[PDB]
Amino acid sequence: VDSSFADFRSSMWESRRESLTAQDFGAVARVQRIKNGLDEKYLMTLDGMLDARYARFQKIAEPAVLSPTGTPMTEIPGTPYLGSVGAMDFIAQEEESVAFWK
Amino acid sequence: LFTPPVDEFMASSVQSQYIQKACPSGVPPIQCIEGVTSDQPYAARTLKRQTELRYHQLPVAVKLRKAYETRRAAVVATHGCSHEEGRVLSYPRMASAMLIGQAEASKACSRYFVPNGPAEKHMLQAVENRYMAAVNGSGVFSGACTDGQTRYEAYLMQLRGKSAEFRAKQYSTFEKESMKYAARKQALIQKGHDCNAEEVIFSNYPIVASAMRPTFGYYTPIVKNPGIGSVINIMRPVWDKNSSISSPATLVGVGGFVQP
Amino acid sequence: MKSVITTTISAADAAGRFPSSSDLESIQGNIQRASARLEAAEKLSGNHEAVVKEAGDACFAKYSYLKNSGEAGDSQEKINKCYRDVDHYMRLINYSLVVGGTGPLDEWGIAGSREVYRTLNLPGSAYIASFTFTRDRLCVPRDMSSQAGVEFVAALDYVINSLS
Amino acid sequence: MKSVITTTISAADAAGRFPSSSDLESIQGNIQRASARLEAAEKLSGNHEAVVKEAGDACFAKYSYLKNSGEAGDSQEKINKCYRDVDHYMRLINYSLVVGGTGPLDEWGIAGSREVYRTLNLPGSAYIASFTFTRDRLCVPRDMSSQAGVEFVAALDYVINSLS
Amino acid sequence: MKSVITTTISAADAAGRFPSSSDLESIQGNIQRASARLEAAEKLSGNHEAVVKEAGDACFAKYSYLKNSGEAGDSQEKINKCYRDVDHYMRLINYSLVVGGTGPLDEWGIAGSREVYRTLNLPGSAYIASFTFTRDRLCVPRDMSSQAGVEFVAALDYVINSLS
Amino acid sequence: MKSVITTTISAADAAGRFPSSSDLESIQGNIQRASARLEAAEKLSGNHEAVVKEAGDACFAKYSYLKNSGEAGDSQEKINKCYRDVDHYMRLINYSLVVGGTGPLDEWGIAGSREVYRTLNLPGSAYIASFTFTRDRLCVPRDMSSQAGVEFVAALDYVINSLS
Amino acid sequence: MLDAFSRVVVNSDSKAAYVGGSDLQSLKTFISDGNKRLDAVNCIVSNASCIVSDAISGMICENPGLIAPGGNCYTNRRMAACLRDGEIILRYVSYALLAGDSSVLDDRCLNGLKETYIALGVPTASTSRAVSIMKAASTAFIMNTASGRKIEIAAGDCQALQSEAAAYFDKVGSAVD
Amino acid sequence: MLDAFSRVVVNSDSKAAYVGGSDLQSLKTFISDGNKRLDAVNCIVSNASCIVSDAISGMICENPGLIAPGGNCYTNRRMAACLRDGEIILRYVSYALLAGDSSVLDDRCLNGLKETYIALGVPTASTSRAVSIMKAASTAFIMNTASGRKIEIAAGDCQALQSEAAAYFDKVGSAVD
Ligand SMILES: C=CC1=C(C)[C@@H](Cc2[nH]c(/C=C3N=C(/C=C4\NC(=O)[C@H](C)[C@H]4CC)C(C)=C\3CCC(=O)O)c(CCC(=O)O)c2C)NC1=O
Ligand SMILES: C=CC1=C(C)[C@@H](Cc2[nH]c(/C=C3N=C(/C=C4\NC(=O)[C@H](C)[C@H]4CC)C(C)=C\3CCC(=O)O)c(CCC(=O)O)c2C)NC1=O
């Protein structure tokens, strides 16, 4: 049982290692994708609605969506879909970085 | 490499006397602390025992240039001296043993000295580049170089040399200075070339005088037993009774190896 | 710091002689192989972070007892020291690919590492697990050109033989 | 092979001089401490088997990865090599307790061990785990006399500092 | 006998280390420059006799006092020694073009030549006159390929700097 | 200046190694034999004057030709140099009994004495006569313990073998 | 020291003439075979330490008289010199692969080693066994047929060069024996 | 010792980062300039002894105080050490042309030479004159404008590299002075 459990661990640390690392790369990828902005067409779909919520509940960014009336949330009334830009765009988040070590 | 059994005794005894001169107290002196980590004297031992086979692997011509030049310079080390003429001319291992014994009991080397200031130091780079020139008679390196033989031995060798300059910084004033005058004598005598301005250079710098050796440039090292084991199963070479200098150069006159 | 230049210049300096035609052929070989080496250096400086990330993740994927209790990485800090060390070794492979010899990788990374690794109880086999993962990981052409792939394998194998 | 005898004889031989009074005082110290050392040697040759058995069992108790499919004891044969090596180290501690110096333990066991251990991919920390278990194992008076225990601890600690 | 191979092999042997990638770059340079050198060697072995003939004829065309009385070629035999010596030097330029370094030309022809030439009263400037005539006479397009011509000029210039 | 301490510390320093158990046994021997040696040192510093007086008186009692004309003590001053030198040798025996080795007696008194003694026409056999008188004179227990005397005899015999 | 070039030159000096056509033709085959030689040397020198480890551990595996007390492989210092010598032998064989001629191996390592191992009591038969194991493992790494490493190279013919390396290891095995 | 490559790497270690794009760009200019560097080194190394002869003979021929009795060139053996030192200086400058970086010349030759020539009584100004003449002759041979040798090479731009070699000779001339 001891020798054969130790025989078991090998063939699994290969695939288990690859699966974990793939989850980490995907994590960074999704977070940067949500940070870059969500287009109108994506925000209409369910996935864009719950990804906008994902960003809100997790304090990653604020993503402008649609006002309760329906007209797009603008800061300045000239151009649609603006957001407030200051001092939080410039603070780096730990979820963007692949490398936690440096 | 193998030396006749008459030789190993003579060279070993000579070694023991120059060790007695170099250290009379028996409290082991500064000059042979050998190593500062504990892996260090072992690795030094193995490198030195392997070097001898690397000296036996040289071409025959270079071996005989070594051999006769050690004979000549050994007589120059005798000071006239007809009896040690006879004993030195008859046995070639013992000649190089006597050269390195005298030069190392008199504390001759730049390994024992410290240059201070740029003038003395460059002078050493010049003298070294003369001997490094004299070893390598082409761009091809000699087979006598051998800093390591595997990986990572060479870095240890770097650590010995770097650890040995500091001991040169450590010696007492009395010792530093007996080194000065003694190195003067080693240069002015072992060369035996009465120029004015050369002896002015040796007058100015004993560290120029420190790096004085055979024309080839590498002092033949002395080893207790070249390629002879400690294991029971030693086959020793059965040496013939006549032996002139070419015969330990060329290793003719060995015959079989006999003993369990 | 060994390269072709320091080898032939140090050799001809040792002869005390002007550099003959053979040294010139050697450096002309350096400027032939330089294209593949600098390609691999550009690409390594491209994606070094993901290389170090997968390297360290595979390193703890193999040996788990390091992250268990004891005499090893038992903090996020020490695992950050781990990924910093793998950052150093990839930085040295980058430098040795720029120079083209094993020079800076030897005299900066390899020399005297053994007393440090036996002193701070760092097992070298974990590093070896990381590097073997990276060498197995890179495809012949997807990651980089084949000539450069070969060069990268050579350097990384040298690290493993220095460390095993 | 260092002892008091070889140190003072080798020193006075290096002077080329007869052994003075100081050497005589040193060997008289050897024949004072000899009683405690030979007591511990008698007892080690008493129960060496149980010592090596608990040492190796604690050695695999700490590191279990050793038994992984590649890179260590992956047979009953290699674990027999393990227990044979611990038999060797206890045999050398016996020899060094007979001699009284670290001589035969050094020149047989310690010297050049590091290239072998880095070559064969055997971690030294497992040995260290075994020896620390044995040293933590013995009470000063129940098993053996108080004076001997100190001597045994000294020798075994020397092994650890040679190996760490 | 120096070439790229003996230089890097002798260097790495002096380090006691395997041949790394840098040595391999150097020898890969040797196998790049090999085509031009072997071209020049084929052509030299083509017309060596006319080269030696015009070389010796120009050699006595410059200095006539050799053939006048005294301490030089005063026979048909000694002029045959002259043309044989120029045969030797062209044969060594052929050898050094095959090997690719100045190795056989140095260790056979150059080394120790100066004691012989000062002993047998042989003035070196006549050799130099022959080689300069030969160097000037060579035309890149007519005689051989241009890259090859450079190699030949290099070797012959080396002879002159060894001899002047 | 040799003692147990300088021998074992100089030896272990020559190895570049920490002081092992053997060195510790040796110095423990020094602190065992110290009681007898320091007893004899206390008693020598007790009655050194009468020792030197009877030593010098026996020295001129044996050889009278010194005090006759010639190449020796021909004054009260030179006989005062005599008694002063015996004061020095008893002071060195005191020092070597304090240290426990022949160190200060050798490096202060013995070394280079032979050129001085052959140069100033000082015959060594008169010193030997004085020391043999002192060694014959001392009783087993009158001014020192039986064990202690042995130590004194040893040191003084060493002086004689250094001087004969 | 002699490469293939110096061997052609010294043989031409034995004939005492110029170089000629056929010798240069064999030399052109060398230079066209050049990158196969380079890649072969890269293969062995890459997998070198692992070759030495497997070779000496296998040699010990065949006969345990070496590891028995009184054998030459007994203890670390002896075993260290053993592993060290395996590394040295592999190094000079790799030199003989770069040079293309065995003269470097003949002068630097081969000359005076049988007498040496006889003098120390090293069993020479066991060393020839270790050289044979290095031969097999080295041909296996040089033909990309190793069961532990499969490096990727453009496929081709390299059997002649495998015969060269096998000839050098057989020179060593016949050299100590 | 440092070439161009090692200088890029050590500077990158001072910045403590990876090598980077611009540094590799300057390195690509080096490698594209490679054969010009090789042919330049072949030019100076070919005409080297004659450069030394003319340079030192011109050095004496400016000021005859050197050849006067009591001058430092006054004997055969002093003159031999003089021509020897000229050959050595030209050798290390040729090394600096192959390496592309002056660190070989800084470490092997330059370090501790001013205090040497001051300690011997060698006039340093006359040495700087000889280095200047070797500079002018070396640039003349390196630009194929020598009046005694006209070698044939495919024409191109080599003025930058002439500025490099002139920088090394000015480093020597400012080194002894
Ligand atoms: C840094 C300072 C420094 C020195 C002072 C010299 C000193 C020196 N001179 C020679 C070597 C020599 N020195 C001389 C000189 C002499 N010829 C004679 O007729 C006179 C007695 C004497 C000049 C006054 C000769 C002839 C040799 C060669 C000796 C020989 O090979 O026989 C050598 C051995 C290496 C060589 O052959 O060059 C050395 C170290 N070298 C240095 O590096
Ligand atoms: C220039 C190159 C270069 C390197 C390659 C590193 C190598 C290196 N690592 C450490 C030091 C360290 N390295 C590690 C790394 C490890 N953690 C583990 O779980 C693994 C076994 C391993 C990562 C794979 C750890 C944990 C330490 C700290 C060890 C300790 O303090 O216990 C040290 C000592 C100094 C320090 O504490 O930082 C050095 C020199 N440093 C350099 O300068």
Ligand SMILES: C=CC1=C(C)[C@@H](Cc2[nH]c(/C=C3N=C(/C=C4\NC(=O)[C@H](C)[C@H]4CC)C(C)=C\3CCC(=O)O)c(CCC(=O)O)c2C)NC1=O
């Ligand atoms: C400089 C060195 C260097 C390496 C060693 C690689 C390593 C590497 N490979 C991948 C990523 C990858 N590597 C491969 C390669 C393949 N997967 C297979 O199943 C095939 C067998 C094999 C080709 C022979 C593939 C397919 C991916 C993407 C998916 C994956 O993770 O497998 C990634 C993630 C980024 C990406 O998707 O590109 C990284 C860092 N990259 C580098 O820059």
Ligand SMILES: C=CC1=C(C)[C@@H](Cc2[nH]c(/C=C3N=C(/C=C4\NC(=O)[C@H](C)[C@H]4CC)C(C)=C\3CCC(=O)O)c(CCC(=O)O)c2C)NC1=O
């Ligand atoms: C020659 C070397 C040598 C050793 C290193 C010991 C090691 C050792 N100790 C025990 C056995 C034991 N060792 C101890 C000792 C103690 N347990 C405690 O909790 C205390 C802290 C400590 C005393 C200070 C005890 C109590 C046992 C019996 C029970 C146990 O295993 O703990 C046994 C099993 C046999 C037995 O019961 O005696 C062995 C092999 N024996 C040897 O012959």
Ligand SMILES: C=CC1=C(C)[C@@H](Cc2[nH]c(/C=C3N=C(/C=C4\NC(=O)[C@H](C)[C@H]4CC)C(C)=C\3CCC(=O)O)c(CCC(=O)O)c2C)NC1=O
């Ligand atoms: C540190 C230890 C130490 C010593 C042991 C002495 C030893 C010693 N004695 C003398 C010197 C002397 N010692 C003696 C002594 C002798 N007179 C005799 O009749 C007897 C044979 C003998 C006493 C037993 C004499 C007479 C001299 C002077 C000799 C002379 O000048 O002729 C000298 C030369 C210097 C001098 O003149 O003082 C020295 C070094 N000095 C030291 O520093």
Ligand SMILES: C=CC1=C(C)[C@@H](Cc2[nH]c(/C=C3N=C(/C=C4\NC(=O)[C@H](C)[C@H]4CC)C(C)=C\3CCC(=O)O)c(CCC(=O)O)c2C)NC1=O
């Ligand atoms: C340049 C080439 C070159 C070599 C090929 C070696 C050859 C060589 N090996 C040894 C020495 C040795 N070689 C071995 C090796 C062996 N151990 C065994 O169990 C096996 C039979 C064998 C490995 C296959 C051992 C054990 C020693 C030490 C022998 C001893 O001291 O008893 C020595 C004597 C010096 C020393 O102790 O290192 C030499 C010259 N050295 C060189 O310089």
Ligand SMILES: C=CC1=C(C)[C@@H](Cc2[nH]c(/C=C3N=C(/C=C4\NC(=O)[C@H](C)[C@H]4CC)C(C)=C\3CCC(=O)O)c(CCC(=O)O)c2C)NC1=O
């Ligand atoms: C500086 C380092 C250095 C190397 C390591 C080599 C690497 C190398 N190998 C080849 C090229 C090759 N390499 C091999 C080698 C073999 N193929 C097989 O199937 C066998 C497994 C193996 C036996 C050795 C073959 C067969 C070729 C192609 C044929 C040839 O070019 O001769 C090429 C040609 C260019 C290319 O393919 O892109 C190069 C550069 N050359 C170098 O300059």
Ligand SMILES: C=CC1=C(C)[C@@H](Cc2[nH]c(/C=C3N=C(/C=C4\NC(=O)[C@H](C)[C@H]4CC)C(C)=C\3CCC(=O)O)c(CCC(=O)O)c2C)NC1=O
């Ligand atoms: C590695 C670099 C390196 C150098 C650069 C030289 C530098 C150098 N030159 C000399 C020594 C000398 N150098 C010269 C040269 C000069 N003659 C003159 O008329 C001019 C002023 C000048 C040439 C321009 C002379 C004449 C001597 C001998 C001086 C003397 O003995 O009086 C010496 C002392 C040793 C010897 O005598 O050779 C040294 C170290 N040596 C080296 O090892």
Ligand SMILES: C=CC1=C(C)[C@@H](Cc2[nH]c(/C=C3N=C(/C=C4\NC(=O)[C@H](C)[C@H]4CC)C(C)=C\3CCC(=O)O)c(CCC(=O)O)c2C)NC1=O
């Ligand atoms: C192994 C030895 C070796 C050499 C010695 C060089 C020789 C060399 N030089 C050039 C080629 C050249 N060489 C020069 C050099 C110059 N032209 C001038 O007018 C200046 C006088 C001089 C300054 C240095 C130029 C300008 C070219 C052409 C431009 C170029 O190729 O960059 C070429 C290109 C191929 C050809 O032209 O046929 C080669 C092989 N390369 C080598 O591999």
Ligand SMILES: CCC1=C(C)/C(=C\C2=NC(=C\c3[nH]c(C[C@H]4NC(=O)C(C)=C4CC)c(C)c3CCC(=O)O)/C(CCC(=O)O)=C2C)NC1=O
């Ligand atoms: C004669 C017995 C004796 C010896 C052997 C001795 C000291 C001694 N010289 C030794 C060696 C030693 N000494 C020297 C210097 C020697 N060579 C020179 O050119 C100069 C002028 C020297 C004067 C002795 C070298 C080059 C070496 C070999 C280098 C090396 O082995 O690292 C050693 C070995 C340990 C070490 O590396 O320092 C020792 C212990 N002192 C002695 O009295």
Ligand SMILES: CCC1=C(C)[C@@H](CC2=N/C(=C\c3[nH]c(C[C@@H]4NC(=O)C(C)=C4CC)c(C)c3CCC(=O)O)C(CCC(=O)O)=C2C)NC1=O
């Ligand atoms: C052939 C290549 C070669 C050498 C060089 C020596 C070097 C050497 N010296 C040793 C050890 C050693 N060395 C000395 C110092 C030395 N002895 C003296 O009596 C005096 C006056 C000394 C300086 C001149 C001492 C005192 C020792 C301790 C052993 C002893 O008691 O002599 C040891 C033993 C190391 C150990 O214990 O681990 C070695 C290997 N051995 C070699 O094989």
Ligand SMILES: CCC1=C(C)[C@@H](CC2=N/C(=C\c3[nH]c(C[C@@H]4NC(=O)C(C)=C4CC)c(C)c3CCC(=O)O)C(CCC(=O)O)=C2C)NC1=O
């Ligand atoms: C201060 C303590 C100290 C030393 C002692 C040296 C020792 C030394 N020599 C080396 C390496 C080395 N050594 C030589 C041999 C040597 N050179 C010659 O030209 C001749 C004639 C020689 C024998 C007289 C050669 C040929 C090399 C290779 C480098 C080179 O081309 O010179 C290397 C480099 C090792 C490596 O590459 O890993 C070192 C460390 N270094 C130090 O720091």
Ligand SMILES: CCC1=C(C)[C@@H](CC2=N/C(=C\c3[nH]c(C[C@@H]4NC(=O)C(C)=C4CC)c(C)c3CCC(=O)O)C(CCC(=O)O)=C2C)NC1=O
């Ligand atoms: C039980 C005691 C024992 C051993 C220990 C082995 C040792 C061993 N390895 C061999 C030979 C051998 N060994 C290796 C190297 C090895 N394989 C790899 O794929 C990797 C990565 C390696 C290092 C980790 C190779 C590559 C070969 C050639 C055979 C092959 O293709 O695998 C051979 C065949 C020898 C011959 O052909 O004459 C033997 C005997 N055998 C034993 O009986």
Ligand SMILES: CCC1=C(C)[C@@H](CC2=N/C(=C\c3[nH]c(C[C@@H]4NC(=O)C(C)=C4CC)c(C)c3CCC(=O)O)C(CCC(=O)O)=C2C)NC1=O
């Ligand atoms: C009458 C006493 C006397 C001399 C001797 C010469 C010496 C001399 N040569 C010079 C300089 C000099 N010398 C040569 C080398 C030389 N030319 C060649 O074409 C070949 C093949 C040469 C070796 C045979 C070159 C190449 C130059 C550079 C000038 C040029 O382009 O020719 C310079 C100029 C120095 C300067 O620029 O500061 C001088 C003074 N002059 C004198 O007054």
